[PDB]
Design a protein around this ligand. Structure first.
Ligand SMILES: [Ca+2]
Ligand SMILES: [Ca+2]
Ligand SMILES: [Ca+2]
Ligand SMILES: [Ca+2]
Ligand SMILES: [Cl-]
Ligand SMILES: [Cl-]
Ligand code: NA
Lengths: 350, 347
DNA sequence: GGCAGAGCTCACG
DNA sequence: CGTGAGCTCTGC
């Protein structure tokens, strides 16, 4: 029998749970607390939302099955977990009460791990820590057999949520030099985010004085979105005059043509195609790609990410290290960088 | 159990199928043709790529199960259809031979309908017309029981693909092809002087509205207010010096350039490598680490990468004055008579 | 020549 | 009310 969870009640329940978490002293009351700590403080965004939503639902309505994700799941107490998460947690709670400390995802239940009828170990999962966190979060929800236990675990979960850090790099280093920072940032792929960050902060060095507005987008935002042309779009006088495609994996001529075509369809006449350290083994005829782009009205050029950063640095006026850190921090917020990216970059400044 | 579909064979099969489709006289020879028509002309992009790929795999390799989408599917003849579609259809075929008429997707097998082990009616789908197309594409693949039947249906599917329209409007060509200009300038080395010209005019394009002063110098003379081959001024101060090498060189030439910039208080040096700057022993990272201890940010770049990066960062307005940039550079580097001639033979 | 998932905007019925 | 299509990103 499917269930309708009352969204006004779930809102009141999670407000009370947050106020309790803000005064919580003994978080070791329930024996799921280590599992809850590891999921909430982990780097997997979607399992945080799934865990909070399941516990909230069961704390609000004892009829629900906390392992159900969709209303038509073939279990008793199935419910539409996506709508509870997006309307209450995303729409009303995480911003004002949690400072985006779950990750500030707009639609976490469209992420692949949430697009299932049940939160289940049958659901395919990336190997390694993601598979471990999948089982931990299943175990917690499976342990939430009463409203009271679910509420107890919800408070512990939000207590650990409130401990999470933001997307801010604090430079403990007295001073770093730009080239060494870039070199360490792009040595690890970090889901494609580090090469995009290196490209973005390099544009900031040259755009600072010319009034450029650099818009780097979340790397998992799709080219079909109206919110972007390519990976990074550069505005002067409210108009995109240059777009950048970054590749930190191997690419072929069709990848290039796909980016050129998106720029051509939006009337952007200059494109830079940047090859990160993993864009290797590429016998690709760049002059033919550039010729093809030219007929489509796009001026296309190529560069390694490292060469692009050192050339931007050499051409720019030198600004305080404080200003470079600002570029990094603003870019990390703009692309809603992942936890592992934040931790990796923070470790560079230590 | 998984089988491997040979991608090079699959390419030959679909090229043959496309040529057969382009001359097909009778598309009604297989009783799936109406279902094939409705899938290929339908509005569900991922079923189009699933259909084509599965028919391609079975036509290529008789061991395949055309309903398998993933190599680890628990059926005989499972295979990695994602990699077949992306490396053959997307990578090499749809654009050049089908005009993007499947949809011109770059990663269709990341689309949700493809992210299952098997193509089956268990998989999530919208009610209505998508539900029907799902069942039709399953039925076609289910009927592709032999190589011969799979090929025939593939040819029919491509025939209907060719009937779709891919309404993209062909823009006009770029007004200003900078890459061509630079390629033409540096195709002849002219004793390393065309590389200096290419680098200098790119700096002019970028600095015209930034208040830079570009001072290029004769490229094969170490004459004393000049630093390296090109000095860039902002506020009467050199902030960047460029050496333009279009012949072999070693780290003594690099350390010499770094030392002169250091001695003048220049902390940024670019070393440009022309097309003829070949047979290089240099550990570039070691040269860079040494220059840092002398207080110099050193970096390396191809002439072509550097010039086109400057242009990409430039305003479009600078393009009117490019011939002025070339003419001023020719004078400043005291170009040889044969160099002025080669440059004028282009503009 | 290995295989396939975590995230995201934009929807449909 | 309920939830899929299509598209980004290399990870393991
Ligand atoms: Ca399974
Ligand atoms: Ca992108
Ligand atoms: Ca990219
Ligand atoms: Ca034109
Ligand atoms: Cl966070
Ligand atoms: Cl839907
Ligand atoms: Na020289």
């Amino acid at each position: 029998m499917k269930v309708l969870v009352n969204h006004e009640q779930a809102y009141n329940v999670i407000i009370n749970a947050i106020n309790d978490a803000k005064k919580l002293t003994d978080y070791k009351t329930n024996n799921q607390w280590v599992s809850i700590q590891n999921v909430i403080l982990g780097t997997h965004l979607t399992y945080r939302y799934i865990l909070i939503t399941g516990l909230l639902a069961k704390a609000t309505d004892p009829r629900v099955n906390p392992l159900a994700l969709q209303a038509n799941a073939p279990v008793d107490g199935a419910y539409d977990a996506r709508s509870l998460c997006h309307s209450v947690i995303v729409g009303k709670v995480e911003g004002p009460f949690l400072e985006g400390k779950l990750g500030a995802s707009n639609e976490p239940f469209l992420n692949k791990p949430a697009r299932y009828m049940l939160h289940s170990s049958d659901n395919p999962v990336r190997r390694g820590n993601d598979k471990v966190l999948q089982q931990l979060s299943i175990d917690i929800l499976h342990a939430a057999t009463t409203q009271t236990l679910a509420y107890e675990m919800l408070v512990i979960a939000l207590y650990f949520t409130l401990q999470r850090t933001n997307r801010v790099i604090t430079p403990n280093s007295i001073n770093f030099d730009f080239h060494k920072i870039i070199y360490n940032i792009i040595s690890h792929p970090c889901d494609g985010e580090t090469c995009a960050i290196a490209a973005a902060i390099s544009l900031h060095l040259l755009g600072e004085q010319r009034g450029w507005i650099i818009k780097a987008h979340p790397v998992n935002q799709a080219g079909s979105s109206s919110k972007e042309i390519l990976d990074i779009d550069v505005y002067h006088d409210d108009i995109v005059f240059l777009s950048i495609e970054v590749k930190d994996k191997p690419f072929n001529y069709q990848d290039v043509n796909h980016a050129v075509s998106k720029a051509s369809a939006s009337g952007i006449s200059k494109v830079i195609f940047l090859k990160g350290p993993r864009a290797t083994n590429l016998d690709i005829d760049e002059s033919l790609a550039i010729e093809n782009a030219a007929t489509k009205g796009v001026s296309l050029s190529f560069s390694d990410v490292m060469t692009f950063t050192t050339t931007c640095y050499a051409l720019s006026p030198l600004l305080s290290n404080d200003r470079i850190i600002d570029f990094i921090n603003n870019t990390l917020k703009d692309i809603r960088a992942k936890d592992s990216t934040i931790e990796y970059i923070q470790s560079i400044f230590k």
